[PDB]
Amino acid sequence: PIQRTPKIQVYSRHPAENGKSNFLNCYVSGFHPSDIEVDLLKNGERIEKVEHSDLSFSKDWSFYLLYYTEFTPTEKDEYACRVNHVTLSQPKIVKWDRDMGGGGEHVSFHVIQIFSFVNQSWARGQGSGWLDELQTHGWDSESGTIIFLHQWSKGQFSNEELSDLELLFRFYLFGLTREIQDHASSKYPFEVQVKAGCELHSGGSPEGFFQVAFNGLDLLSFQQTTWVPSPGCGSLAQSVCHLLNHQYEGVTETVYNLIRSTCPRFLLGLLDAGKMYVHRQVKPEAWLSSGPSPGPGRLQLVCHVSGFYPKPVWVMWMRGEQEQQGTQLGDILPNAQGTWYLRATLDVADGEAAGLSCRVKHSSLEGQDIILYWHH
Ligand SMILES: CCCCCCC[C@H](C)CCC[C@H](C)CCC[C@H](C)CCC[C@H](C)CCC[C@H](C)CCCOP(=O)(O)O[C@@H]1O[C@H](CO)[C@@H](O)[C@H](O)[C@@H]1O
Ligand SMILES: *[C@@H]1O[C@H](CO)[C@@H](O)[C@H](O)[C@H]1NC(C)=O
Ligand SMILES: CCCCCCCCCCCC
Structure with missing residues (x-):
């Protein structure tokens, strides 16, 4: 549930x-x-x-x-x-x-935790590191170590600092688990999700966050130096904010330091080490295919734009210079090696299909757009 x-x-x-x-x-x-x-x-x-x-x-x-x-x-x-x-x-x-x-805009780095408690003595745990929507780290559950996915995933930190983080995390995990195993008593499964880290906005202002969800619901968040429960009430939230607020701080001092300080510095190291490897502006390639039939006498035109980086992209169906208002843009999905994918569709009568084209705009194109024409 x-x-x-x-x-x-x-x-x-x-x-x-x-x-x-x-x-x-x-x-x-x-x-x-x-x-x-x-x-x-x-x-x-x-x-x-x-x-x-x-x-x-x-x-x-x-x-x-x-x-x-x-x-x-x-x-x-x-x-x-x-x-x-x-x-x-x-x-x-x-x-x-x-x-x-x-x-x-902003870049972000966050650490993700998912804990799955079927009961007191049975629980899955998994965690990872994300630079915007690109996964850059993994966590080895059994050994309590970090998996660095890319050659640049250490991101200008030394081994000695990254060791300390590992140790830190290990204690912290021990913490959550003991703490969460108590609070113990028709049942019995629940899920916990933690999203901790930082955004960095243009101009250099960072914005930490450390937020929890319970059973998929907002539970609590860390907001400019105060742990804050989501409206319930909401008593597990208030209680746990209370423990973190006042039973122990110094953990929130740690957390504050971690999300305001460590995080952005790591994040920017990631950006610096990443630029070296991958990747410059990348041109998309594009192609047409039909999509699922919208009905008898009707066609669905699909236009695919794949492998473009960075993300900002413009795709539309056209008759000449006229945008076709029916165009639906899907979501921009991630590709294997980090670039992007998007598709635009259009539903059209059998006989009005001819002459429609797909226009694709992207930074990498030097203002020379990709045009693709529907043919029968
Ligand atoms: C399975 C899930 C594994 C998930 C890990 C995946 C991570 C992935 C792979 C790797 C990416 C690595 C990158 C480089 C990290 C950049 C920095 C990031 C942005 C900040 C991260 C935020 C954390 C998430 C917050 C954690 C809480 C900490 C640690 C403070 C608590 C203090 O414990 P303590 O005060 O010492 O407290 C201790 O523990 C307990 C209380 O906590 C107590 O019992 C004890 O008293 C003890 O003192
Ligand atoms: C935890 O769930 C497992 C798996 O179904 C079961 O074997 C075990 O007895 C459960 N509860 C406890 C308290 O160990
Ligand atoms: C180990 C103690 C430090 C934990 C800091 C984050 C706590 C988030 C609340 C989790 C409630 C399920």
Whole structure:
């Protein structure tokens, strides 16, 4: 409790051309609880070499996962994303289909924790590090060590400082668990989610946060130096804010230092070390495919823009210079190696399809847009 149903999006990283090698992405988001089963399928079989990000969540507090794998489109073969969840009567299988598109400021650094307590002596725990929507760290649960995903993931910190963080985290975890095992007594499962870290805004002003959700609900947050419960009431929230407020501070002194000070300095180190490796402005490539039929005598035009970085992008359906108002822009989804994916669709009558084109705007293009024309 309580329950959210997974949303599933499947998309390739390149145009689909039979025999030619490609990447199958599956993005699974909007779900609660965290317990889930995602497989990429080839011809009904589970593909055993896949990549997945660790479990993360949205501001909603609902979870999302990215999945991907190498694949080769063929006339013959068949690919899917199969998801099982407590909100699903049956595992949803959503095929990837060329012809349907395969249906379904500031920088930030945050540390993510998910704790799953089935009871007192049984509990999963997982945590990771995120630089904006790019995962940069993992946590080795069994040894209490940090997994550095990229060559630049130490991000201009020394080994000696990163050791201290590891140790720090270890104690802290011991803390949460003992603390959470007490508060003990028709039941019995619950979930806890912590999002701790910092935004850095243009001009250099940082903004820490350390916020908790209980069973997918806002529980409490750290707000410019005061732990603050979310409206309930709301007594677990007030009680725990109370413990953290006044039983122990010095932990909040630590936390304050961590999120206002350590965090942004780490974050900027990440940015500095990352620039070296990856990546400059990257041009998207684009392609057309139909999408699912909107009905008899009607077509769905899909326009895919993939592999562009940075994120800011403009995509629209056109007749000439006229924007077509029906255009629906999907969400901008992440690709395997960190670039972006977006698709725009348009539903149109059979005979009015000819002459419509997809226009794509991006920084990397030097003002020379990508134009693609629908043909029959
Ligand atoms: C499974 C989940 C694992 C998740 C970890 C994944 C992390 C991933 C992979 C790695 C990225 C690494 C990067 C470089 C980190 C940059 C800095 C980040 C932005 C700040 C992070 C914020 C934390 C999250 C807040 C934690 C609370 C701390 C630690 C203060 C509490 C003090 O315990 P203590 O006062 O010493 O207190 C101790 O513990 C208890 C009380 O706490 C008590 O019992 C004891 O008295 C004891 O003293
Ligand atoms: C915890 O759940 C597990 C798994 O179902 C079970 O074996 C165990 O007895 C449960 N409770 C406690 C208090 O150990
Ligand atoms: C180990 C004690 C320090 C923990 C600091 C964060 C506490 C967040 C509240 C969690 C309630 C479920």
